[PDB]
Every structure is written in C-alpha cells, then in structure tokens.
Design a protein around this nucleic acid. Structure first.
Ligand SMILES: Nc1ncnc2c1ncn2[C@@H]1O[C@H](COP(=O)(O)OP(=O)(O)OP(=O)(O)O)[C@@H](O)[C@H]1O
Ligand SMILES: Nc1ncnc2c1ncn2[C@@H]1O[C@H](COP(=O)(O)OP(=O)(O)OP(=O)(O)O)[C@@H](O)[C@H]1O
Ligand SMILES: Nc1ncnc2c1ncn2[C@@H]1O[C@H](COP(=O)(O)OP(=O)(O)OP(=O)(O)O)[C@@H](O)[C@H]1O
Ligand SMILES: Nc1ncnc2c1ncn2[C@@H]1O[C@H](COP(=O)(O)OP(=O)(O)O)[C@@H](O)[C@H]1O
Ligand SMILES: [Mg+2]
Ligand SMILES: [Mg+2]
Ligand SMILES: [Mg+2]
Lengths: 379, 379, 379, 379
DNA sequence: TTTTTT
C-alpha cells in the first residue's frame, strides 16, 4: 500500500525506538540512547538512519512533512512500555558502554541490549585507557600523597578505595560516607577528580536534603538525584553554635532505599530511583538528634590526615595535632584538573579497584567505631 | 456513504472504545484496557484493529490523515458514559484478568466484561504459577524465618497473612496496619516482596499524608492513590523529641472512606476512589494527638521479632529483649529479589491466602489492645 | 444558494442549542440538557439530529469538516442568552424530568421546557418506583433502627426527615445541618444512602471551606458547588488541642446566600449559584472564633443515638451513656448499598417526605437549643 | 537530488548554528553568539547568508515557506551537544572578542571559534585604545590620587592593581577581597570605574548573601552570578550595633567554589558557574561567627588611606587619625564618569595590568595578617 | 512562594 508505512515498519523492525515507563520515546543515535520531552527526537533518528535503507526508499526521506508522517505512523505502533537501567555493572558512555566484569568496551549493536538512559556525556578513548603512562604515574603519586599506604592507614585506605570505587555500579547502596578532615587536606581535590572521571553521573546538591523535610512541597534537590550514581553534600555547617538544625536521622534513614520520595516543581511524579553513592564533605564532627541501632549501621567515615601547605605555615602545620604528614602545595594541580588531564587514568584505576573489590557482589559496610557519639553507645 | 464513516461505525460496533465517567477514552488493545489523559489512543486502536475488517477497508487505515478523520468520526458518537472497576475480586494483568474466587485465568474477549482500567503491567505466565518449585521452597523458608509459625506467634502470623492477602481485593478497607518492629527484622523485605508480587498496583507516598492537612492546595501524594490496591507510608520518625508533629486522627479517619478529597496539580477533579490497604512501616510505636473510640476501631498492629545479623555482632544481638529469634544475614537475597525471582510464587501464595480467608466476604478487624496509649483508655 | 447555511438554520429553528449567561452552549440530546467545556457537543448534536432531516441533506452531514463548518455557522447565530434552572421543584433524570408536586414523570419534548442543566446521571425506571417491595421493607427497618420513632425521639425524627428531603428542591437553603453523634451510629450509612439516591447531584468537599478563606487563588472546592443539591463535609477535626483552627463564622454566614464567590482553574467565572444543603458529619460539639445571634439562625443539629456493635463489645456499649439502644452490626449492609439496591426505594421515600413537608413552601429552620456555646448566650 | 537539503548542509557545515547543553540553540549573526528561546534567529541567519550562494540557489530563499522548510531540515541535524565558555582569557565585546595573551583584537570569523555567550554589551572602537591621551592622563592622576605609590604603600598598591585586573579573565577565583575603608574615600569611584570599564559583566547586589543561608527557598541573587566576572558587595551595615547580623563563615566557604548551589524562583536548575571576583565594600572592622584556619586562606584586605572633602571640614580632615592625606573634592567627576569618558582608558590600563601580573597563570593569594581578629590566633 | 498561567 503506502510507501511511507513500509518505511515506518522498517524503522520499527530494527528496534531503535522504545516507549519508556514515564511516557518518553527514547531513540538510538550515535551509539547512545537519547531522549527529550519538549522536543521529541524521532525525526532526528529517522534522518540519521536514512542511509541504512534501500535505494528507492532513501530519497523519499528528505522532505520534512514526509518525515513527520513517518513519525506519526511510528507513534501509533508503540503500545507496550519497556523498563530501563536493569544492568547494574555497566558504565554507559557517549559512544558505547564499558563492561565492568571483564574490562571490555562494547560499541554499536553489541552495546545496545543494555538499555541505559543516563550517560557520562563524553566518548571513550582507548588509547589513553592504558595502564602505563606518565599521567598514571602523576596520578598515583598524588593518590599516595593524599592517602599514604602505611600500616597505620591500611583499613582507612581500603575504605577510601572501596567508597570511591562504589561510584561506578548503578545499584542501590546502604551507607553514607563522611569525608572528615582538617583544612586543606585533599577532599575537594578528590571530589574534582571523581567529577572529571565519571562526568555526568555526578551531581552536587545542598545540605537541605539532610535537615529539612523532603515531603511537603516541591524539592528539586531530591528530584535531581534520579538515576545519578554519585551525590556530594559539601560544606556541612558547624553545630557548636546555636540556630543550626541537627541532622535528621529520619532523612539519613530515608536516603538508603531504592525509591526516595520527592517531586520537582510543576510536576506530580513522586518516585525517584536511587542509585546514588552519597558522600558528605564535612569539616567538623557530625551531630544527630536521635541515635539507635537503625542509624549506627548506616554510617561510615574515612579520615584524611595529610596537610598540603606552603613554606609559610610549615612550622604551624608540623606542630599541629590533626595532621600526620606535611607536604608542599602545588599550584598547577587545581589548574589542569579541570582540563581533564587525569580523566582516563583515574577511570582505569577506579575500574581496577571495582573488579578487585566488588566483583562477586557490591556492598558497603558501616564503621560506627569512629564517632564519639556512637562510641558512648558502644556500651 | 463515506467509507470512513462506515469504518467508524464498524469499530464502534465491536464495543472497543468507552467513555468513562472522568472524561477519558479507554481502548482495548492487547487484551487490556488502556488510557492516557495527555494523548488519545483511538488512532492506535484503529491501526491495531485494521486487521478485523474486509480487505478493501484495510488500505484506507494507513494514511495518518484518514486515521485522524476516523478518530474524529468516532469521538462524535460516544454520548453515554459508563463506570469502571465494579468487580472487587478480579486481578487485572497486562494480558488478561485472573479470577480470585477459583483461580481461573480469563483472556481475550472473555476477559472483557470486567472493565478493569488498572493493570499490574506484567504478563501472566501460568507455567510458573505452580506449587512445586525450588523458588517456592526458598520463599516458604524466608517467610517462615520472618514470621515463624510457633504457638506463641499464631495470631500474629494469621493477622500478617490476612493483611498481606488483603492487598488483592478491589474494595474499600477499614483499618490501618502498622508493621511495628525493631531494626533489621524483615519489614522492608516484605514490602519489596509485595511490590514484586502485585507489580504496578503498589505506590509509596511520604509521611505528609499523616501529619499534615491534605485539603488546601495541590497534593499529588493523595492524588496518586486513585484506584491503587496498596499504599505504603514507610519510615515513620520518632515523636519523643521536640517539634515532632503528632499523627492527626482526622487524616486517619479520612483515609478509611470510599472517597478521599484531594487534587493533583493543574486539575479540577477533587474526588479520588480509595481502594488502598494502607500499611505503615514504623520503628517506634505511634502516638496521636487524641485517643477516642473512633480511633480505637481503625488501627491494627503486627509485630516482627526475628533479628537478622552477620557473625560479627551475633552475641550482642542474642543478649537483647527486642528479639525472639536470631538468624544469619543473607547478602544475595535482595539481589535476587530485585530480579523478580520470587514473584509468581508469592502471587500464588497470596491467592491461596485470599481464598482461605476472605472468600465468603472481606473485612478487617482492629486490634486496639496493643498500644499502651490505647491500653490506658480501657485500663 | 448555500447548503450548509440552510442546514444550520434548520438546526437552529428546532430550538436545540441555547446560550447561557455564563457563556456555555447547552445541548439537548437523549432527553437531557447536557453541556461541557472541553469537548463542544454541537457536533454531537448535529450527528444525532441528522436523522430528522430531508434525505438530500443527511448524506452531506457525514464529513467532519462539514460538521465543523455547520457548527461554526451555528455559533454565529446565538446572539441572545437564555436563563436556565428557574424551576425549583423538578428532579432532572437522564431520560426525562420527574415532577415533585404530584409525582408524575414527564419525558420527551414535554420535559424540555424546564431548562434543567444538571442531572442525576442515571435513568428513571418506574418498575422499581413502587411502594410495596422487599427492598422497601428492609430500608424501612434500617431507617427505624437508625432513628427510632419514640416519643423522646420524635422532634429529631421529623427534623432528620425534613433535612434529608430538602436535598431534592433546587432552591437556596439558609441553614446548615450538623450530624452530631458518637462512633458507629449510622451517619455514613445515611450519607451513602443519600448518595445512592440522588447520584450526581451530590458532591463531597474538604473542610477547607470552613477554616480557610475561599477567595484567594483558584478554589475548585467551592467552584464545584455550582448547582449541586447536596454538599457533605465529613471528618470534622477536634478543637480541644492547641494548633487546631476554629471554624470561621464568616464562611458559615457567606455560605447561606444565593451566590458564593469562588473560581475554578482556567476561568474567570466567579459567580456560583447555591442550591446545596450543607451537611456536616461531626463527632464533637463544634466551636467558632466568635458567637453571635447572627450565627444562631443558620445552624441546626440532629442527634444520632443508636450504636451498632458486634457481639464482642455488646456489654461495654450497653453500659455507655451516649447511647440509647444497641443492635447487631450487619456486614452485608455496606456491601449491598454500593450496588444501589436501595436506590429507588429511598428515592420514593424522599419523594413522599417532600410531598408531606415542603409542598406549600420550602424553608429550613434552626434549633439553637443544642450547642452549649449557644446555650451560654441563652442563659 | 533535493535542493533545499544541500542549502541546509551548507548552512550546517560552515558551523554557524550550535546546540547547547541546556537544550537551546545559539546562532551567529552580527559577529555575536546571540540566542533567543522565544524568537528563533535561524531564518534571519539564512536570509542574511543568502548572498554567499550560487545564483541558482538564492531564488529558493525568498518564500517564507521555503525558509521554514530549511530551518526544519537544519533542526534535524544537530545531534551532539557543545559546551560553551571554555576559554578563560578572552574578553568578549559586542563586535568581537579581545584576546589578552598579546592584546590583539579579533572580529568576524576569527572571534567565532571561542564560543562566548555573555558580552560586555557595547561595541569595541580601536581608535580610542591609544596609550597617550588626555583621558589617560586624567585617569592616571585619579588612580595615583586614590592609591598613592609611596614606599609605605607599595604592597597595597600592587595588591589593589592585582585585584582590579583579576576582573577580566573567566577562571574561578579563590579569594574574597574587602575594600575596607572610611566614608567618602573613593571606593564607589573604583566601583563606577570598573562598571564603566567592563559593563554587563558586573553586578552589585545586597549583603544578604553574606548573613543568610543559601539553600532554603529561592535565591535569585545566586542565579544572577552565572558567568559574571565581577561581583561588588556594597552597603554593608555596621556590626558593632545591637543584634547586628554576623558575617556567616559558611557562606564565605561556599562562595569560593567552582559551582555554587542555589535555584532561582520558579526554576529547577541548581548548578551555577562561578567566574566572579567578589569585592566587599565595608566601613568598619568585620566580625564573623567563628574563626578557623579554613577561613584564614580565603581573605584579602586592601586599605584606602586618602580622604576627599571640601574646604568646609578641611581642618577636621587634616587632624583625623584614620587618614594619611586629604585633597579637594570634585563635583564633575560623577558627571563625566557616567558619560564613560574613562571607559577605554581604564580598559587599557586593566589589560596592561593583567598582562603584567597573570600571564603565566591566574591565582589570588590571601593575607591573614591585616585584621586583629586573625592576629589573635597567632598562637 | 508555588500554582496558575500563557
Ligand atoms: N597530592 C597533592 N599534591 C600537591 N598539591 C596538592 C595535593 N593534594 C592537594 N593539593 C593542594 O593542596 C590544597 C588542598 O586543598 P583541599 O582540596 O584539601 O581543600 P578543601 O577540602 O576544599 O579545604 P577545607 O576543608 O579547608 O574547606 C589545594 O591547594 C590543592 O591544590
Ligand atoms: N529469611 C532470611 N534469611 C536471611 N536473610 C534474610 C531473610 N529475610 C531477610 N533477610 C535479610 O536480612 C536483612 C533485613 O533487612 P530489612 O530490609 O528487613 O530491614 P528493615 O526492617 O527495613 O530495617 P530498619 O528498621 O533498620 O530500617 C536484609 O538484608 C534481608 O535481605
Ligand atoms: N439497621 C442496621 N442494622 C445493622 N447494621 C447496621 C444498620 N445500620 C447500619 N449498620 C451498620 O453499622 C455500621 C455503622 O457504621 P458507620 O460507618 O455508619 O458509622 P459512623 O457513625 O459513620 O462512624 P464514625 O462517626 O465513628 O466514623 C456499618 O457497618 C453499617 O453497615
Ligand atoms: N582622585 C579624585 N579626584 C577628584 N575627586 C575625587 C577623587 N576621588 C574621589 N573624588 C570625589 O569624592 C566624592 C566621594 O567619593 P566616593 O567615591 O563616594 O568615596 P566612597 O566610595 O568612600 O564613599 C566623589 O563625588 C568624587 O567626585
Ligand atoms: Mg579542597
Ligand atoms: Mg526499613
Ligand atoms: Mg464517618
């Protein structure tokens, strides 16, 4: 019958268009699933895939109204919804998905059955994903400077590696990590390194998600954690002064389930999938309002005890108590981190740690033996 | 006359399009009633049903403009409205509806008179609906290790079975159930098992539906309860501190009526049908602003008294009063629960329980003798 | 000359389309005046009336574009508006209009001169409108159980009958009736019986109209009171505690006028005709911010003093003060009420009460000898 | 084959239209990367570029329908997102981008590869960018008057020059500078000079961003800092009064990060780029809530020691202990400053200073030894 | 303030 109907049937046969649960129409272009709500991408996919059709059918696919007719025919054939993000050991990129169980990097048709929606936003460069490189040497030097691998800092180093590496798998975690340390110790440098490593799967929200009710009214901070694999809560304010609200234990206990409750502005969606590895950048000891067994089993803390300073404050840092080693500060480090110099090296280090630690199963274990408030309860 | 008008008349003769009370246009495709408020589905139904018409009539159902013309013709014939979800003991799936009185599964045109708008979303596979299976044995062991069938725990076990089986019927209930218990006991595991069992007929709202006014302004947390067969209000906070809002008895009174008043954003419809078995996952025993007879007969409480722990703190938990039986924590249990492995077995168990308990008639009976606050008013 | 203009003139000459003061376009199809905002029914009317036209004109009336053109022609002829709903003693049904002065039921064009906009939503069947029937006996027994016809309960019985029967007349009532009583007495049963009786002339709204202003912003809770003949506001909160807002006498005084000010979303029509009988289901004596004689002549109270109980707690209820009679609860009553078993019987009883009471003139009256707050001002 | 498709290809491959990460389209007309979300400038670009095509292609760019078709065809070719504002050493004007490495100024296609979004708002005129001019001499006299270049005031002079010159590059600053001085000293003079120099890349808001939280509710002051290169904080109230708000340290720590978290009204985007130099205009010694080493490395203070007054209080100014030199006040300065008589002269001075100081890298240093509150902790 | 708008 109609020629454009055959075009729609052929586009549907290759299985490039899917109907999601939320009602969006995800397409498959440039080896990455993409979607949008205000402007659907069906016509973009049609024009892109034009080339893979027979000769007499390609020339028919240039007039915009014919493309619109093909899209209208396509939209009348998608009746069944398909769920997304069911594989929790994959790291999708802009040109494929990097498998984590064995380090292979699929692309094209091979990297298609893993229906991943979110993506890092940048392509994968296999040349720089090699272990031996000067960038790897510099990165290893920096990592060892931040967390020295001595015997007194063994369990701390293992916890640091495990927590940092947990930011790759897209599963649900069950513990919160506190980056405790003094001033100018390396927390923000680690944050920026991780952000450059994973890219789009990393958001930074405010402290409001910890001490305020997250049910009444809109709360876009909760709504922006949808399908993210890492969330940072930086600069926790001190509580030694008055007027500062305590950390609600209910909020912590509500941030470790596969579905958190919260809605964005002007919308009615109230369910958010929770794949986030929540890390809190603090400067002082945290204080809570209620303490019980249900809270002490969901808290972990790693300590940074290496101070980077200038020659001016060398004697001040040497005689301090919160530091165990003093090192020379560097100026170009903060400069060339944003330029994505240690990106692929850190990615390789993270995947190596992931395959070393979480290969059978991924899980985080609380360490409540470090907080004095919980040390009192260790009765 | 116009051949398109004949097409519309033939489509209407098959009784596939219906005009519901709220003003939607439900269709009948893939053995399930579907509807969407944003985009109509009449064109999809026309395209899908083009096959059941003579050969000369099929060729006109290909051009989208003709399909829109037929949709416009159909929309000007539905004058009289009908109501949906009149039978409360039928479970609608994505490819049929399963009867609950005798376990018979209907499909096709036979499963059409029961106008069930809602659906679980996943198809029915009778090959996995049998009693003999290793999955059934594992699920039975898990259930018996969560709520043991000893003599001391007989009434609690039967109340647990009754409450869980009540999540299948499609009529109004009259009791709120609290899943009271200590930490690491088996509450969230039961919640996730039920979610895997009943699929999409299971929503999770915040605690604002309990300690806040649900009338003024928008409130999608109430508007999403429309025709839901189960509702969870998880993770209740403690009320022994300051500024802790008590549970308003007015909300509890309202949540047990056939109509719950509340509207979503950008809409005018304010009435919502209530089919939900409200279950609250709490950790401390609740306290209300006032206690009276009208609140005495609308609350039931079950107890979970089996702690799961790792060999680390085994003796620390064995020396506690809050537990009656200590077992070993299993890691992969949640991993294979999220994969929907114990879905159909638990569905079969739920059907068996419902047929054992509520087959003559369905009702829930309160247990007010569990709350010390309620105990004082009868002391 | 033109042809579609002749068809439009013929349609208008039959006097089937009218323009209201609010600016709507009411349509006379299937023996009922219908109207809707989202979907204009003029095309539906054209398609329905196609049958009573000359044959050479009927075939022209099948293309949707031609129907749209005829609708556009019709919309440009209605220059003068016509008032609606001026007869206050008519009950409009889905298949005609039932009189309330002599019990006769008109149909067809005879029941067209009464411009009735709203409708009950269900058809009228004279087969079940008889006096002798087992359902009538059951309903009479239930009514006598809820309100015994004793000498001490004589005035309350007649006030209850008058208040229930006042929900049929489409005029303005200047009194608010309170359903004051203790738990498990039968207020909800009466509400459900009334709802099954009248049908769509019954709206339930939240308590936000009694404790919050009804002017600021959109307020569909008040905007849905337009031409509704009954309004119920159950689950009245207690006020003995702190933080409970008292009932504003301003709202009560404003709700007793033939025009309440309130607007729905997406509209500018802020005038609402009040034909409702406001009834409140309460369990405590209501309180207000201030008490005055102007609030005295608008409030009436009936008392429910028949506790229904299961055999488990028969003795405890028998030893109570706030009850005068204890009976056995029936589980199937609420189940079979939802099936509209006692619909036409209660309709006939209400018609009989209306013919007995309000035939000369209809007016509600206050009983200020019930509320202790008002008894203070009578001291 | 097709003819408009080749036109769209020619428009695309010349790299004139680009897609941003937020979903908007930026075009290139009038030598500026302007964009509008409501008015698409694609048609304007097509009609402007029609001159650079063969004579047989121009005739098809006259019908508005054909230009709309070309726009629609172009919109279906932008698949990959492009990030903007990556070069931190380019100052964008309205008619081109001025480089800072060598002082050369580009325009047209040259100043196009640098995807600059924001702009100063005024055109660049090379004829007024000379080194010798009466405006240069008057401006140099003013600058030497406000900050005398004595050996007692050498470090302060160069620190002032560095802080002023830092307001050109688009990197991320890491220090806050206090323009602490007495009244009528010349702080507003420098503010107005800078505002005339850089124009649109300069905003001034209230002091609330220093004594308030930055997470609760909306914060339009944060959304105003997006891609701004200089922020001036004036009208700082005295703190030695009663109940005066204290400068919150947490705001200072959160205001020096590459991304500040905060959402504007009615919006959901919570991330913001921090390219702005923060200069605070106080009058007295600032007091904070808490002093710690984390606040020691984010504070810089310059001193103004030249008072201006009329001969009225000449002896009072000459005898005051807080000044170092007093001169005669001028009235026409604020007249010709608002007429931008010292616009390009100050710009050239700023460019010279930037080339002198921050040509290898950009970095601002703190100076903790200028406030006694910070001299207390020398122990 | 948001929602409502628009
Ligand atoms: N391995 C390293 N080698 C050289 N310099 C380093 C190294 N790690 C960090 N630095 C530098 O030392 C400083 C450490 O800053 P850091 O990231 O600890 O700050 P922060 O966590 O934001 O501080 P605070 O807790 O005071 O707010 C930075 O100037 C950084 O460039
Ligand atoms: N029968 C079983 N055998 C072994 N492990 C089990 C069994 N049932 C549950 N578990 C595991 O024991 C743990 C119990 O955790 P659960 O989700 O029940 O906690 P919870 O009731 O939500 O806790 P809290 O009150 O602290 O929030 C889970 O890891 C679950 O997988
Ligand atoms: N005549 C009757 N005989 C037997 N049972 C009856 C009779 N009338 C009502 N009932 C039953 O008694 C119960 C009355 O409960 P109902 O919901 O009417 O109480 P209520 O007064 O609204 O309660 P509350 O104010 O506490 O919410 C229902 O189960 C109803 O079916
Ligand atoms: N170098 C100068 N030469 C002439 N007049 C000056 C000079 N510096 C400041 N003034 C005059 O002093 C007046 C007030 O100075 P102002 O910039 O307001 O000081 P502050 O910023 O401390 O309030 C201005 O109107 C300006 O004309
Ligand atoms: Mg840092
Ligand atoms: Mg739990
Ligand atoms: Mg009630």
């Amino acid at each position: 019958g109609n020629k454009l109907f055959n075009i729609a049937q052929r586009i549907l046969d290759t299985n490039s268009v899917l109907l999601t649960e939320r009602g969006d129409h995800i397409v498959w272009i440039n080896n990455s699933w993409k979607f949008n709500s205000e402007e659907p991408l069906i016509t973009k996919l049609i024009l892109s895939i034009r080339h893979q059709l027979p000769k007499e059918y390609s020339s028919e696919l240039l007039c915009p109204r014919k493309r619109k007719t093909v899209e209208a025919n396509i939209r009348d054939m998608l009746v069944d919804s398909v769920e997304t993000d069911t594989y929790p050991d994959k790291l999708p990129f802009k040109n494929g998905v990097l498998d984590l169980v064995d380090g292979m990097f699929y692309s094209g048709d091979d990297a298609k059955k893993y229906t991943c929606t979110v993506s890092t936003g940048f392509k994968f460069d296999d040349t720089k994903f090699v272990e031996d490189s000067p960038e790897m040497e510099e990165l290893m030097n920096i990592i060892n400077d931040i967390q020295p691998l001595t015997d007194e800092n063994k369990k701390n180093r293992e916890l640091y590696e495990k927590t940092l590496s947990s930011c790759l798998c897209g599963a649900t975690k069950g513990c919160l990590t506190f980056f405790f340390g003094e001033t100018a110790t390396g927390k923000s440098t680690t944050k920026r390194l991780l952000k450059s490593a994973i890219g789009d799967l990393f958001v930074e929200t405010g402290q409001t998600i910890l001490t305020d009710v997250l049910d009444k009214g809109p709360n876009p901070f909760i709504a922006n954690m949808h399908l993210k694999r890492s969330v940072f809560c930086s600069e926790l304010p001190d509580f030694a002064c008055s007027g500062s609200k305590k950390i609600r234990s209910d909020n912590i206990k509500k941030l470790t389930e596969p579905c958190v409750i919260g809605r964005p502005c002007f919308s009615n969606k109230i369910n958010n999938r929770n794949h986030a590895t929540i890390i809190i950048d603090t400067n002082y000891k945290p204080v809570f309002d209620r303490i019980d067994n249900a809270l002490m089993r969901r808290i972990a803390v790693v300590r940074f005890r290496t101070h980077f300073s200038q020659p001016s404050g060398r004697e001040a840092a040497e005689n301090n108590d919160a530091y165990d080693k003093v090192k020379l500060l560097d100026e170009g480090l903060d400069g060339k981190i944003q330029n994505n110099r240690y990106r692929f090296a850190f990615l390789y280090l993270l995947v190596k740690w992931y395959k070393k630690y979480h290969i059978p199963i991924m899980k985080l274990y609380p360490t409540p033996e470090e907080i004095p408030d919980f040390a009192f309860y260790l009765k």
